[PDB]
Design a binder for this molecule. Structure first.
Ligand SMILES: NC(=O)[C@H](CO)NC(=O)CNOCc1ccc(S(N)(=O)=O)cc1
Ligand SMILES: Cc1ccc(S(N)(=O)=O)cc1
Ligand SMILES: [Zn+2]
Length: 258
């Protein structure tokens, strides 16, 4: 894998090694709020993170992942558009070089400063690697970030980033409560899509919350001090690690709310 977010290896190049990049259910997409249909059959989301066990934070050269113990049903997503039980494996963000870009999904073409992805896999497939081979394998909960007031529950993440500056660095990251990253409302849009990074597998039920969270300028500035490069390599700031909106094709975006 040599894909990334540069001019020479960014999203417009990915199709050469991952031809599904041009597929029928790629993510992210623009959410056209007036075209999304309210679906009264959609259930409230059930986010059950009370027993979540965070373990570690990793700079993987594209973003940082906060990893969870997914060896039991400890932190699960169910309800909403989903059938069955999806276990939280990791969360990460996508963000920009400036506050006017960074999100992957857009809302009426609006780009947010960043987007949080809480990644869950369907327990009926047993392991994450098996789940990504299935059309209903993953559920990703997407949350927009705007710049304003600080998000108190984000600060523990911000403060460990200095210890994982470069690709391949990890740090212990226990006892982090991801409930501190949610907005007040669980109103959402949903559609069938894909992973937004290679291998771009078409295995995701996307659940994108309408209500953004607010983070401070200082918090997002610390995201932008991370590096895509490994230790001792030429410094490349980890910024603009987002894929732009892809064609909606033969898909419907449904709203949980009127
Ligand atoms: N684990 C596995 O057996 C293989 C090989 O390592 N991995 C994958 O086939 C997919 N890995 O997918 C990560 C991933 C990528 C993108 C997202 S996003 N940005 O759509 O939430 C969320 C997870
Ligand atoms: C040099 C190079 C550029 C881009 C890729 S890709 N198709 O994985 O994005 C691989 C190698
Ligand atoms: Zn993501």
């Amino acid at each position: 894998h040599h894909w990334g977010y540069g001019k020479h290896n960014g999203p417009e190049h990915w199709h050469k090694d991952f031809p599904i990049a041009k597929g029928e259910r790629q993510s992210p997409v623009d959410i056209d709020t007036h075209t999304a249909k309210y679906d009264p059959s959609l259930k409230p989301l059930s986010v059950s993170y009370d027993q979540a066990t965070s373990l570690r934070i990793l700079n993987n050269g594209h973003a940082f992942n906060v990893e969870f113990d997914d060896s039991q049903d400890k932190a699960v997503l169910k309800g909403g558009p989903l059938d069955g039980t999806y276990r939280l494996i990791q969360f990460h963000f996508h963000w920009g070089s400036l506050d006017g870009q960074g999100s992957e999904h857009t809302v009426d073409k609006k780009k947010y400063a960043a987007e949080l992805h809480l990644v869950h896999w369907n327990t009926k497939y047993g392991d994450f690697g098996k789940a990504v081979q299935q059309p209903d394998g993953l559920a990703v909960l997407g949350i927009f970030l705007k710049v304003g007031s600080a998000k108190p529950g984000l600060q523990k993440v911000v403060d460990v980033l200095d210890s994982i500056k470069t690709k391949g660095k990890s740090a212990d990251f226990t006892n982090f409560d991801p409930r501190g990253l949610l907005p007040e409302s669980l109103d959402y849009w949903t559609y069938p899509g894909s992973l937004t990074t290679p291998p771009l597998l078409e295995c995701v039920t996307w659940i994108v919350l309408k209500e953004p969270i607010s983070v401070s300028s200082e918090q997002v500035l610390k995201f932008r001090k991370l590096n895509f490069n490994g230790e001792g390599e030429p410094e490349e700031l980890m910024v603009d690690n987002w894929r732009p909106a892809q064609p909606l094709k033969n898909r419907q975006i449904k709203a949980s709310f009127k």
